[PDB]
Amino acid sequence: SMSRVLQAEELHEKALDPFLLQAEFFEIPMNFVDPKEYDIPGLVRKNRYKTILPNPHSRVCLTSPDPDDPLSSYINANYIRGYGGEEKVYIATQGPIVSTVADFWRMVWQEHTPIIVMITNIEEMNEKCTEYWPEEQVAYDGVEITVQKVIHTEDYRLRLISLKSGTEERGLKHYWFTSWPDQKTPDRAPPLLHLVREVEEAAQQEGPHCAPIIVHCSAGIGRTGCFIATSICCQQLRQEGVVDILKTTCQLRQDRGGMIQTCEQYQFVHHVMSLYEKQLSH
What we know:
Tyrosine-protein phosphatase non-receptor type 5, alpha/beta, about 280 residues, monomer, globular, 7 helices, 9 strands, 9-stranded mixed sheet
């Protein structure tokens, strides 16, 4: 872990120095997995991008439908540590593809996941995230998924969902964020900060030892890493009076290679934290 602790003043200027940001950012190792770490015929069919693989130490393993088949148990997903190193606060995962939608819902059920955060624009529902929820009701390898209600806000749609399986019913909140920016300029920061704050409140409503929150768009690393890094640093700012975006990004990369994929994404986290520091100081 590298570290660069930013106090208010330094955070605002840092966010506005793209030359220093890219210097810092491209020193951080990607920690991508060697594909020759998964010798598994057909694995590529389960992967949206053939060279974005889950690091093995942190990867989510499915215990269905056949735990004894290494392909049946594979999903492109990693457990992600939260603020302060807490284990399994999030799962970062690719947007499901046609052949992994049942696997995704299998992981939701197996992990008791209470919240999903989807950061894929309405425009990008082609080959970036396969619609994986129903209009009302659907079922996958044992799990009845029902959309009970759709709450529209300015920058996300929240689906309240029930999952029936045998005699168990569970709730699920699906946050579909709709305001991911093309240009990562500061005027695009407030909706992301809003989404982070709403999800944290939802997560705390689950009580002690919240099960993992699933976050995704397409590859499970870039926008996903921004959202988790921003969540982590918001806690850090509230708790410590500083942010350490570099150390947080390093933590994330240890959990899953490529987390926060582009320098524009890295600067955007800085804009968002700069905005929040300002909000807190007034």
